[PDB]
Design a protein around this nucleic acid. Structure first.
Ligand SMILES: [Mg+2]
Ligand SMILES: [Mg+2]
Ligand SMILES: [Mg+2]
Ligand SMILES: [Mg+2]
Ligand SMILES: [Mg+2]
Ligand SMILES: [Zn+2]
Length: 462
RNA sequence: GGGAGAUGAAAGUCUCCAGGUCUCUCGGAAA
RNA sequence: GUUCCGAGAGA
């Protein structure tokens, strides 16, 4: 992705977009009894913790574009993935506006708790002023789609979240690209049934984990990914995508049966205009992080990428033997023979992708089930039933979360949620976590789930 | 580095408004 | 399993 130009809003006529410049995260009652390094991300260009220029850091992710047109390898990769998807029998017809707005069994309703985006937010119109779940009314939606149309600019915001202290000093906060409600509705109408099919089928047919529940899906991953496991990380995946990968995604949608009119909507994701503060800018390439379908389209593109890298790098690859599961840029994959991911990473560079060893390990090709992660979780066989695999969120990550809060009233729910992540690490580690929680009065008053009950409920899921 | 307010001589400080797409999970209430 | 409300995690 690459910024094509930047203009003042006084030139384009767009409304200014401003979001919170102070964090909602504060130290919790556990802040001092657990260790941690993370703090709230920089939200303001004058944050005294910065050691670099803020806005230069924010937009450095737009590293540029390489290819714009699929080569033979990307074409062959796209068709291979498309052929694999045909067994899902995705319904390519338009989803009704009522279903796109108010949801289905496998597609959640539009989130009425978040911004309606451009221009509604700058005009004080909320999603709930347009959508009503008690009536499932679509007349007001159609009125505002006629009034304001489609392909509205994305509204750029800085995400309020914990970041490592080195990302604080380097100004590496993450940007949110808020979709206009009009475009979320329109993409959901075009692709809503594909969303449903992916959500209902996490695994190696979609090549996607969207919709998975790690508590049970982890035991499936070694069965879905047999053979020689491999994995790697991307640096700035979303913004590094060149237009070629959107053309590749179009090839996939066309091949599985979408009309040209539906396929053409992807150009409105490849090419987007954005408003940040008082400026409008044009971005060619790059997945806009807050568009409808971000995680699925990122996951589909990852399936195309790895296929293309394999057949461009190595001779005699049989893509039918590739197994992979992506969640956006995150991935785990396998193949019947070990493959040299350093060589794959070199090919990735030609395509404008920056691939690095999985989980900041020093070199490629040392991934195994004992050290693999996915969705920040490791894989730990149960001691009694080794065919059942615990997802292990590292305790260090759970400690970072417990040290901050948006509201001390949330402490009971927050801690219980972390307990359901922590106990997979084992009885000893869980009891140490619970003991530290109970060393202050607020924690000693909480209801904390019992390890043996947690594990017994987990075993019953199978 | 926005809007409105409070306080203040100001610098500041403080309150509310303003902050995506999705998935999974827990909790409260309800039929 | 459903609905509304609140929360946590992940991409
Ligand atoms: Mg499902
Ligand atoms: Mg990973
Ligand atoms: Mg301000
Ligand atoms: Mg608000
Ligand atoms: Mg519930
Ligand atoms: Zn443009």
């Amino acid at each position: 992705g690459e910024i094509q130009w930047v203009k003042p809003n006084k030139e384009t006529g767009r409304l200014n977009i401003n979001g919170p410049t102070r964090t909602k995260l504060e130290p919790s009652v556990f802040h001092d009894i657990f260790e941690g390094n993370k703090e709230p991300a920089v939200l303001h260009s004058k944050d005294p913790r910065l050691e670099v220029d803020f806005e230069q850091a924010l937009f450095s992710k737009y590293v540029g574009n390489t290819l714009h047109e699929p080569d033979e390898y990307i074409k062959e990769a796209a068709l291979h993935y498309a052929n694999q998807l045909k067994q899902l029998e995705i319904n390519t017809s338009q989803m009704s506006m009522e279903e796109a707005c108010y949801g289905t069994e496998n597609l959640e309703a539009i989130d009425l708790h978040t911004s309606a985006g451009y221009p509604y937010s700058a005009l004080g119109i909320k999603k709930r002023d347009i959508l009503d779940p008690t009536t499932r009314d679509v007349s007001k939606m159609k009125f505002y789609m006629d009034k304001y149309g489609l392909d509205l600019p994305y509204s750029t915001y800085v995400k309020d979240e914990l970041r490592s202290i080195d990302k604080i000093k380097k100004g590496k906060s993450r940007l949110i690209e808020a979709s206009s409600l009009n475009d979320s509705v329109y993409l959901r109408m075009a692709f809503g049934h594909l969303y449903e099919a992916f959500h209902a089928n996490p695994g190696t047919i979609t090549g996607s984990a969207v919709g998975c529940n790690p508590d049970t899906f982890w035991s499936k991953l070694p069965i879905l990914l047999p053979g020689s496991l491999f994995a790697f990380d991307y640096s700035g995946y979303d913004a590094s995508l060149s237009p070629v990968w959107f053309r590749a995604l179009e090839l996939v949608l066309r091949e599985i049966g979408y009309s040209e009119e539906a396929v053409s909507l992807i150009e409105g994701i490849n090419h987007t205009h954005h408003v940040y503060r008082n400026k409008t800018y044009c971005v060619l390439g790059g997945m806009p992080s807050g568009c409808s379908g971000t995680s699925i389209f990122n996951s589909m593109i990852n399936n195309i990428i790895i296929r293309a890298l394999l057949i461009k790098t190595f001779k005699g690859i049989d893509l039918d033997e590739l197994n992979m599961v992506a969640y956006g840029d995150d991935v785990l994959a396998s193949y019947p023979f070990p493959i040299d991911c350093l060589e794959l990473a070199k090919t990735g560079k030609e395509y404008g992708l920056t691939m690095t060893p999985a989980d900041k390990s020093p070199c490629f090709n040392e991934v195994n089930w004992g050290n693999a992660t996915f969705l920040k979780r490791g894989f730990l066989p149960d001691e009694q039933f080794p065919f059942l695999i615990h997802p292990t969120m590292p305790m260090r990550e759970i400690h970072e979360s417990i040290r901050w809060t948006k509201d001390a009233r949330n402490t009971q729910d927050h801690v219980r949620s972390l307990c359901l992540l922590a106990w997979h690490n084992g009885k000893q580690e869980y009891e140490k976590f619970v003991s530290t929680i109970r060393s202050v009065p607020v924690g000693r008053a909480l209801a904390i789930p019992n390890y043996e009950n947690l594990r017994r409920n987990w075993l019953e899921l199978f």
